[PDB]
Design a protein around this nucleic acid. Structure first.
Ligand SMILES: [Mg+2]
Ligand SMILES: [Mg+2]
Ligand SMILES: [Mg+2]
Ligand SMILES: [Mg+2]
Ligand SMILES: [Mg+2]
Ligand SMILES: [Mg+2]
Ligand SMILES: [Mg+2]
Ligand SMILES: [Mg+2]
Ligand SMILES: [Mg+2]
Ligand SMILES: [Mg+2]
Ligand SMILES: [Mg+2]
Ligand SMILES: [Mg+2]
Ligand SMILES: [Mg+2]
Ligand SMILES: [Mg+2]
Ligand SMILES: [Mg+2]
Ligand SMILES: [Mg+2]
Ligand SMILES: [Mg+2]
Ligand SMILES: [Mg+2]
Ligand SMILES: [Mg+2]
Ligand SMILES: [Mg+2]
Ligand SMILES: [Mg+2]
Ligand SMILES: [Mg+2]
Ligand SMILES: [Mg+2]
Ligand SMILES: [Mg+2]
Ligand SMILES: [Mg+2]
Ligand SMILES: [Mg+2]
Ligand SMILES: [Mg+2]
Ligand SMILES: [Mg+2]
Lengths: 190, 132, 65, 61
RNA sequence: ACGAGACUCUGGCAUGCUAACUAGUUACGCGACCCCCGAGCGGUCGGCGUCCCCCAACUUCUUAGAGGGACAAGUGGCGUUCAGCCACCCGAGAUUGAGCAAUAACAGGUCUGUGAUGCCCUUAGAUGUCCGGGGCUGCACGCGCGCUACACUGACUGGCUCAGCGUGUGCCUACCCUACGCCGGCAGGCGCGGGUAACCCGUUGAACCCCAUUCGUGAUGGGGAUCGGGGAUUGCAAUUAUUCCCCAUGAACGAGGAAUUCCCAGUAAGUGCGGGUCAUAAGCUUGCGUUGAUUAAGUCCCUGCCCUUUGUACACACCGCCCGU
């Protein structure tokens, strides 16, 4: 049998263009599930969350702020609607769009701080692939959340726009701006 | 951490000393023997003692241990320690000596030995580490 | 083991200038019977029995009775 | 140019609070090459790092 | 030798044992309803028998007893090849959470818990003890622990569908938990029953959550402070509003400076429900479930506490000692 997310999005055609991030994005055959809800124990051991499917990771990271903690069914519904909107707008597989957005959003070089409480001085360092995936997901969710607040626009539409802009590489997205600023500061701290 | 307190180690060593014959490399047989021979008022303490006894038995099978010694092991070590070569390693058809050694032997009227062979002494006298 | 191995008593005595307090703790001995001590031993006390003497076998002997 | 490198051995924990990790990395293009790098975030042996500037080297502990 | 560990309670596994009408399951009879195009060895039934003269079996699910089970045991690495550490297989589980907790001390808190208690003070115009009325809550202002919010991942109106821990009619002692019928629009009022409890409330129809409807970035149908007028319950007594209900009124608040708290998995947070106080009664506390994550498997940078070396004119121990005008 063929397993498709939400019953309509296949995973075979999706492919990852980054060799570094191939081992930390779980979208492929053995990680193909019907729904982004498994009640799994991924936080028990280190590096075990790299085996969690990336859609479920987005769903987990969308339960903010504290007024939305634990409401995972609403988050699953939001993700479903966002994928529908993405497919309508672009015309391609929303999973590929999500993979491209996560690849483009992850910072590649960061700056580590040495700070005496007021003044701070920094030095440029590298970012591991797992932290790249984590920070990309966090930035995407934060951008969607800030876009939807105090505006007549569904959270699903804002999430879809954020993902589309991040996958396209456009600077209209929150995640791309944050990544560019972090990398500029890291470059200047060399 | 999984460090064993001295109670478990002492009980395991005494059990292995007294009942080495009845034990082996199986944890479950060891834990069945321990309750037969010893009085442990706890199940978890008995399991810890048996699990250390199994590890110690494996270590003994690998080789001697710094601690306990088995009577059978001691007797077998005696047999391994009575090893005797067919010929003496001291027996040599030719033994090399320095001229001073030959003079010392001569002063003790032992200069007639045929096994002795006088070797040329080292020409240079440099036997000290270079100070620096 | 403090519950069944230790006997405690607290008392007050009124002397001319005030109250004195007395505390007494007694640790009972282990008794197989329950007369003058706890029946069960301390949890961490392990008593390993001394093995009995065994005759070393030399020749196969068959005994029929 | 941007280079890819493979983590060969994890060396230790550096930083004021120990946030960074010191590791040994070998370039994919030239397997003979190997340098010492500081990485931010959880990293283990076999990970692939993206070096934007591959000439810099870190003072090992 | 004490402390640590061991130990006790608790949470996970047992289709193996023990045995249950104050727990059930399955099966078989009766009955109600649906499909006469498949009417059937058909579907639904928290509807009635199957122990008590005779009319079924059995513990999977529920309760609680006795035992088992996990020991870093097996494998591969790293280690002095030791003590032990990492990974993996199998496995319910490879670190569940609490209780108890040493030698020595503090001028730490408590005389307002005690018919524990030494000294003072007072004892009939009482600092004893009752009764009546007030106060403890009084408001130019500062400081802590908290509740509700600043909305659309929302509010409102309907519909649908799931828990656990516990309490319950009291020596004095008056005051219990409530099913069902009727009246009222609601807070409530009348009847008439069960329960001293796995028996009755109760299959505890909980809230978040789920599915539809309305609203549409407007201090707005967000928020609900402050006030006006009515109604009802507890009490001997409600004014300085006990509490509760209904119309009306509709404040600040658009995420919060310097600074600062708690937390590593069924955890944080969201959401309700019990117990204590309780004639009247939770914005507190102590427990219980339900939904359920981001981040980390490190360090001595901040804070603090331990060790080792070292210096001392300190020992009431740096809140010290000490010099000169
Ligand atoms: Mg919005
Ligand atoms: Mg059973
Ligand atoms: Mg004082
Ligand atoms: Mg007192
Ligand atoms: Mg008193
Ligand atoms: Mg007094
Ligand atoms: Mg008081
Ligand atoms: Mg009066
Ligand atoms: Mg009065
Ligand atoms: Mg007061
Ligand atoms: Mg307080
Ligand atoms: Mg608060
Ligand atoms: Mg509170
Ligand atoms: Mg909602
Ligand atoms: Mg409202
Ligand atoms: Mg409405
Ligand atoms: Mg509703
Ligand atoms: Mg308004
Ligand atoms: Mg309003
Ligand atoms: Mg009034
Ligand atoms: Mg007053
Ligand atoms: Mg109103
Ligand atoms: Mg409460
Ligand atoms: Mg109450
Ligand atoms: Mg209080
Ligand atoms: Mg420090
Ligand atoms: Mg000095
Ligand atoms: Mg000294």
């Amino acid at each position: 049998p063929d397993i498709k997310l939400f019953g309509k999005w296949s995973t075979d055609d999706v492919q990852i263009n980054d060799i570094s991030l191939q081992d930390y994005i779980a979208v492929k055959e053995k990680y193909a599930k019907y729904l982004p809800h498994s009640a799994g124990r991924y936080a028990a051991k280190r590096f075990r969350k790299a085996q969690c499917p990336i859609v479920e990771r987005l769903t987990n990271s969308m339960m903010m702020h504290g007024r939305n903690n634990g409401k995972k069914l609403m988050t699953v519904r939001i993700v479903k609607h966002a994928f529908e909107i993405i497919h309508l707008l672009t015309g391609e597989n929303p999973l590929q769009v999500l993979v491209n957005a996560i690849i483009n959003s992850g910072p590649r070089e960061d700056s580590t701080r040495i700070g005496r409480a007021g003044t701070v001085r920094r030095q440029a360092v590298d970012v591991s692939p797992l932290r790249r995936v984590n920070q990309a997901i966090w930035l995407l969710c934060t951008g969607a959340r800030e876009a939807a607040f105090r505006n007549i626009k569904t959270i699903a539409e804002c999430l879809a726009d954020e993902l589309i802009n991040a996958a396209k590489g456009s600077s209209n997205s929150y995640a791309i701006k944050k990544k560019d600023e972090l990398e500029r500061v890291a470059k200047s701290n060399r | 951490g999984r460090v064993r307190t001295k109670t478990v180690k002492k009980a395991a060593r005494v059990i292995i000393e007294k009942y080495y014959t009845r034990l082996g490399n199986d944890f479950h047989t060891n834990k069945r023997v321990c309750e037969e021979i010893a009085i442990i008022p706890s199940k978890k303490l008995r399991n810890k003692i048996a699990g250390y006894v199994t590890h110690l038995m494996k270590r003994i099978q690998r080789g001697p241990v710094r601690g306990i010694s088995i009577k059978l092991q001691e007797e077998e070590r005696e047999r391994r320690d009575n090893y005797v070569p067919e010929v003496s390693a001291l027996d040599q058809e030719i033994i090399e000596v320095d001229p001073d050694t030959k003079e010392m032997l001569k002063l003790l009227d032992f200069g007639s030995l045929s096994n002795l062979q006088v070797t040329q002494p080292t020409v240079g006298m440099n036997f000290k580490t270079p100070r620096g | 083991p403090v519950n069944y191995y230790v006997d405690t008593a607290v008392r007050h005595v009124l002397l001319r200038q005030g109250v004195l307090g007395i505390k007494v703790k007694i640790m009972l001995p282990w008794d197989p019977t329950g007369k003058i001590g706890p029946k069960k031993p301390l949890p961490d006390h392990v008593s390993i029995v001394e093995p009995k003497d065994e005759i070393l076998p030399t020749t196969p002997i068959s005994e029929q009775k | 140019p941007i280079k890819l490198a493979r983590v060969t051995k994890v060396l230790g924990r550096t930083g004021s609070q120990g946030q960074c990790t010191q590791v040994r990395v070998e370039f994919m293009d030239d397997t003979s090459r190997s340098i010492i790098r500081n990485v931010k975030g959880p990293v283990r042996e076999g990970d692939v790092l993206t070096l934007l500037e591959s000439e810099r080297e870190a003072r090992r502990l």
